[PDB]
Amino acid sequence: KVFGRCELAAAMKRHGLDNYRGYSLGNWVCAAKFESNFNTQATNRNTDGSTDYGILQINSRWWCNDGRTPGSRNLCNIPCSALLSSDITASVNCAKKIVSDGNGMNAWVAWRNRCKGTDVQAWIRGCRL
């Protein structure tokens, strides 16, 4: 599924991400924009053999099981394919764990490089939320 901007904002709010760990909804929408361009089916291989999955590009090195990432963990206790669903519940639940892990949203390198410090409210501009 490719979400629209406000559509995703609303779904993230619906699943309790708005202001989760103090990160406003625009931060989460911005992260999704630059991780996946709002496409729930996005997958990208990392040079080390792990893969990133879904709207927030969650990495099989730590967070989900894909069966092909040696030595990895599965701290969200989910198959990585669950992170590709149209329904964003599994990605949101796992992202809540990731952002609680100590470094906040810096876990998403694209968020640090492209969202952090910027006018992230622009991402929810005009949205009926």
- Please give the residue ranges that form the binding site for Cl ion (CB under 5 A): 11, 69, 87-88, 104
Has 52 been annotated as catalytic? yes
Nearer to Na ion, 46 or 121 (CB): 46
Q: Which residues pair with 39 in a beta bridge?
A: 2
Residue 104: contacted member of Na ion, Cl ion, none (CB under 5 to 8 Å, by partner type): Cl ion
Nearer to Na ion, 5 or 61 (CB): 61
CA distance 30 to 48: 26
With beta carbons less than 8 A apart as the criterion, state whether 104 and 110 touch.
no
Residue 88: contacted member of Na ion, Cl ion, none (CB under 5 to 8 Å, by partner type): Cl ion
Helix/strand/coil for 30: helix
Helix/strand/coil for 64: coil
Residues at the interface with Na ion (CB under 5 A): 60, 65, 69, 72, 74
